[PDB]
Amino acid sequence: RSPLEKASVVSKLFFSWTRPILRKGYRQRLELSDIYQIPSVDSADNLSEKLEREWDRELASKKNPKLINALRRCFFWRFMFYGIFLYLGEVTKAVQPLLLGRIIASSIAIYLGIGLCLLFIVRTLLLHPAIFGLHHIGMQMRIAMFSLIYKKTLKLSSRVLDKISIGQLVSLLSNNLNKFDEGLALAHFVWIAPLQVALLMGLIWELLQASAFCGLGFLIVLALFQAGLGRMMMKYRDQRAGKISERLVITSEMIENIQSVKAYCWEEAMEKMIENLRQTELKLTRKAAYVRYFNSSAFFFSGFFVVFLSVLPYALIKGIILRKIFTTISFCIVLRMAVTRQFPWAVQTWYDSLGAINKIQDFLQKQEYKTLEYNLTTTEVVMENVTAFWEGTPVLKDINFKIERGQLLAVAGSTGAGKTSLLMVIMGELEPSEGKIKHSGRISFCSQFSWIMPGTIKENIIGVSYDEYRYRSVIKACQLEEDISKFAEKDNIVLGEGGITLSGGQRARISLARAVYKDADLYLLDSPFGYLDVLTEKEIFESCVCKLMANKTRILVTSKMEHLKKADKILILHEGSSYFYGTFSELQNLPAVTTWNTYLRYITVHKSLIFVLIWCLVIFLAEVAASLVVLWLLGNTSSYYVFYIYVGVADTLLAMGFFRGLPLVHTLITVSKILHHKMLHSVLQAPMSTLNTLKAGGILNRFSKDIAILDDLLPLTIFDFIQLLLIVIGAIAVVAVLQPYIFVATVPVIVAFIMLRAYFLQTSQQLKQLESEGRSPIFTHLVTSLKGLWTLRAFGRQPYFETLFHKALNLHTANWFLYLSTLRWFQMRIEMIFVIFFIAVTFISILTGEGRVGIILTLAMNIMSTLQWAVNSSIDVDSLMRSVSRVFKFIDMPTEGGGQMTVKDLTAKYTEGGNAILENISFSISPGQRVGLLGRTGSGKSTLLSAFLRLLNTEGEIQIDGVSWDSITLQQWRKAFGVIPQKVFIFSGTFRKNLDPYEQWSDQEIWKVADEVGLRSVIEQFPGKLDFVLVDGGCVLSHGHKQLMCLARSVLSKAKILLLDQPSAHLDPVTYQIIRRTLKQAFADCTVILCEHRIEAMLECQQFLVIEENKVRQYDSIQKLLNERSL
Known about the structure:
It is classed as atp-binding protein. The protein is mainly alpha-helical.
């Protein structure tokens, strides 16, 4: 099924293998089934077997067991030929300048023109094919390492897994998701660098043999300077981490508590708080990027200075002909790339791969979980002299209990008894320091929480065997069929992992049903009735817990007395000591939208953005005229060649000035700051209609990561694209005018540039989006499988678990290779366009003074590498700009817009015109009274409180305080009503700052109110006087203190209403008595509405406003409510 095998050799050289697949994808949409079959050798199981033998052999080789050698052992000569072949191609590109110098001496030279074109043709085929081949091994190496991690995680013991955090390996696993795969192409760079450096210097020495050391010294000095900036840059970025973490916590608090923030009527205060932290953080980023910007300019402004310095030492003895000058300049650019781009990057990248393998080898040693599979036995249980620790003394001592067959075993204990560890020790999942135990081969387990993977009931039931009769008989016996009464697809009801979209009680019953319906050599139930309550527990006890499991010899743990009554024995532990162990009678004995139009608006979002950008364009044509005029003057004593070298320096001719690149960096930095101010203000203005629509995780993730990318990563490469494009486009123009018809050739050549990029981007954008989309399933299965280790290890279904993961990695690999193969296909065809232009340039120039011909000839070889880097940068531009467009979409957020009061015809709905939560509600609010708004609680009364707050997708006519719901400002109306929060979100800061961020309260008004509110005595022990910073979201203050803080804030706000709800469910008796002394005086002249579910909690209300479904009733007193509203 793989088109690669059914392909011709020419398709491998011409990249025609992906030509048809990409062509078909250009018309139709990116179908998920369009992914071609993976290579037969690329099979996950086949690759895993080869690495498994080496890994076992590596450990068996010696005590040291260098796993890195084993990985190289099976994959060394596979790429060793590629490294040698690549080095031959790299040397060929260097030899080209020597041949180009022969033409400078001049007919017969036409023979050299074919060779110049031939050298590029041979190099083009070798380089592209080598790149595709080399990258393939990187995926193969990464696939085996990624798969091997799953095997290691499947054998670790609880003693090591619990001690080590999840981020030790799970986070490290995602670190190398694309590092080693993409970077595998730099393995042979170091080896090629030594030979190339000597060869390039040898050809340079063949010309003068005197100033050879001058060129190497300049490169070494620049390399040290370039490296030194990175050390400061990395440290500066590391220093910026502290400010980023502080801002992120505040942003999360605002995002999570958006509902409270809107009620707090202090959104502008929260906006100002984030502003102060962001300004200091932006100062570090602007300075750090400036250091990188100055360092990045080194390469673009190095060739002219280095070449001129080396040339002068040789020119001192005698001024050589221009042929030697051109040869050195061409070699210098190659030498500059070799000394800066083809060596400095390799050293850093090469050690990165070694470090990952060291970490992989580090995790190879860990506490392994021993297993005995299934040993034949008489199904007898035994336990005596058991001793172990929770990891300081033994949490158990002399646990003597043995059962021959069929004995009813039961478990019991206090809170935190730790019997699960003893049960794990009984099953072998916990290490016993002493004692012995005889148990049957297999055993059935039951966990407290079911970490069932995504799938239907039938999918979970069919784990080792599927039975039609059991699917009906067990479902009725386990009440699963009864729970299926709401299923439309019957047994085909599949949900996600974690049981998010399933009944909580039935999920545990259904999960235990698969183990209960399946036979086993032993049974070990733990918290089987964890969710069953009253009727469910009684039904299970009388029909499933004791009737269904009657025949099988089982040991269970439960708190039901009826279940214990059926048990023949019971063991009770009391703080590490078994208080009772025996019969029961013993105790009773005593998204991918590419809008080019929207790009201009984002680009033109700064005051000086237009002016700064236009400045470089104005200077762009300015330098071109001088270079053309200098050539038109000189070309149309000893220092004459200096002007030609300076003019011939393409990098220097288009080099950005000292006051050119820096201004763009400063201008680009302010763009993110302006966007952040607009985004923060707009986000707080989102109405509940749209605020509740967006997921909580989709806001911070689209704000924390997006803001950093647009600031740090974006401007660093954005300026490079403009800098590279200016030189590349400008250089061709000078040659175009010089040749008689190069403009005609460029006219047809420049048109082909759009066709290649646009067609490739059509599939590349979809492939990149599909590649990231499929990565989620790998992470989703990894976490889900890790949590359910104990349940899976009980049955030991490793082969089923291993098979469940081997196929998953293949799906990501198939999309990865297709996206990687297509990426090279566009790049491979790109070199063909340049070769044709280069051939046309040579032909016209040859048929055409030697300075003009020589300058044009030099620029021909000096545009190859620049064009390649230019095309690659333009592709990634859309990838980074994609996040900015999404932020702009978020920027278009929808706009949000005397106790006597009354309203009528108030109908409210949570959604826009959805089900009417309120149905023409009308009520009378007499001042100076307490009206309990209770009723049929338990169906959700938050909407009714929100209805009085007008925070729903509806509207009304609230004739409160002499004003209408629309006449007065919403912000002004927001200060009228006050509510008691259910879970207050106090700002992380000092008590004075957190409680009154607006700072409108005076110190006298603060100190006196604190004593008056009664919180001063409780908060007297705060650091200093009251400046104790409430770290970790106010964890220091209690729930009553938060209510007291809520009372303190409300008292200062002088709110006319006090919407209290769920008081008894959150307040302590001491706080309630304390509140009764204060709230009575605080609301003595206010109209509050105290709602609650408990009838006793509503007995304190003067009136009895009993809420009802879709029609809130009323009662003037308890007489009518207790007679009609209650029943």
